[PDB]
Subunit: 269 residues, 2 copies
């Protein structure tokens, strides 16, 4: 019988998650392991419900659980849980991201091209509510940039709608940083729709590095994650945890990854 790994993701509609999942599945499958995916973005389910569903059929779980590290690791007992993009708590392992680095790099690009009226589009429903949003706000406030916060539901359509309304109230906006690439694609459509040229009238920078970015027009500049690297980070950590090479909950079980700036056509740099 082969090792079976459960993969929990909050949806399949943000294209980041199927790209992430495909990477993990590739690396696990090449080890001869089986993977089952639970897309829990339906019926009010949570990351904890995902782990409860998967646990009887898996030896381990890799998951974006949205805050349930402690309880999920307890459901799993001695089977390692590797959580992504959240507080590691009592989870066996964790992969997190350097948002202060990403914030510095992305903001730098907009400072380099002399953008004077920046907006940050955050995912949510006044103040940034996300770790990455807080980092971007942090850097813009440290620099003293004149900037504004836009909050919208995390879909391209909700991002378009919010960007469109904001542009009407703030027509001079010339740099937009988006919470992720899905929302950025909506921003680009609001810009196109309003008659603005990109990047000449307004630049756009996303986050994630989804393949979709290469197919937009203009092509999306973004803080990209190397999806092979994120997959390898999770799978190697799991090999370590299963083999005893890595001690659950130790420093060696907490990994931090960095994004890299990929310039395409939605910036001038």
């Amino acid at each position: 019988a082969r090792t079976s790994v459960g993969l929990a993701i909050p949806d399949l509609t943000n294209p980041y998650f199927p790209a992430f999942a495909s990477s993990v599945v590739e690396l696990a499958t090449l080890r001869g392991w089986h993977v089952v995916v639970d897309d829990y973005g339906h019926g009010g389910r949570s990351g904890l419900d995902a782990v409860e569903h998967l646990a009887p059929q898996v030896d381990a779980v890799i998951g974006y659980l949205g805050g349930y590290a402690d309880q999920a690791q307890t459901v799993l007992g001695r089977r390692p849980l590797i959580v992504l993009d959240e507080n590691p708590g009592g989870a066996a392992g964790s992969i997190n991201f350097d948002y202060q680095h990403a914030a510095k790099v992305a903001v730098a690009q907009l400072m380099d091209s002399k953008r004077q009226h920046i907006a940050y589009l955050e995912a949510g429903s006044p103040v940034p509510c996300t770790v990455r949003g807080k980092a971007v706000a942090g850097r813009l406030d440290e620099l003293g940039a004149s900037w504004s916060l836009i909050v919208a539901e995390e879909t391209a359509e909700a991002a378009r709608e919010a960007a469109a309304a904001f542009l009407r109230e703030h027509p001079e906006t010339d740099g937009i940083l988006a919470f992720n690439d899905l929302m950025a694609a909506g921003v680009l459509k609001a810009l196109s729709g309003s008659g603005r040229r990109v990047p000449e009238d307004c630049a756009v920078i996303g986050m994630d590095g989804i393949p979709l970015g290469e197919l937009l027009s203009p092509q999306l500049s973004t803080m990209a994650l190397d999806l092979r690297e994120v997959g390898r980070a999770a799978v190697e950590l799991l090999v370590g945890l299963l083999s005893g090479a890595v001690t659950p909950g130790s420093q060696s079980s907490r990994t931090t990854l960095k994004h890299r700036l990929v310039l395409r056509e939605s910036t001038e740099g």
Copy 2:
């Protein structure tokens, strides 16, 4: 005990060949939505790795599920054998003895898509097929949907060309760019699917051709990406909620005994509709 979740639940496996063609995550999400709302558990096996086949996916899922819904890449019959009386619902292939099947009317789609190009009087049409032409003197249509389009264009006496490329946006862009160097007159392009169409739009843009003014583009699938492209992609589509409902409702009927496995009523044929966006005119 009163506080707990009650009743042991149906478990359904979903087999998909990859998660990199955006159709498959959209399809999966729609099926997971409907199943989840019936209180069912669902697990997805993305088998597009390690040389695995749709049969391997079904072999893996079988012991932890009561039924499978999948795109199996030609292994329907053998997969239903593995599953025994646990129902398989396959899509888009010859179902053999599978308990249930959903197929699409590609003659109808071809007629509708071609009609749009005729209405706009495109004179030099190209169909971009998913596949390879390494074993023949020139490209020939290899997919069911592709044969249907070639059939329609031959029937209408159109002067048309066939392009073949691997089913990725980048392979499509590269094959479209090469073709457009040789055939600059091309003014309408039908693509195997939306992902390939996104590549075609990039080749047209790279070649200095306006879409739709100089060249129209029509895809197939109705993936949400089509609304984010510029121009937004006109496409032959069915609502993924309908495709999802057709599969789950078939499985409900098979599990309940309302539908006999393998019977005529266990085979559903769905029809795409033309969704006009910006990559066509009129």
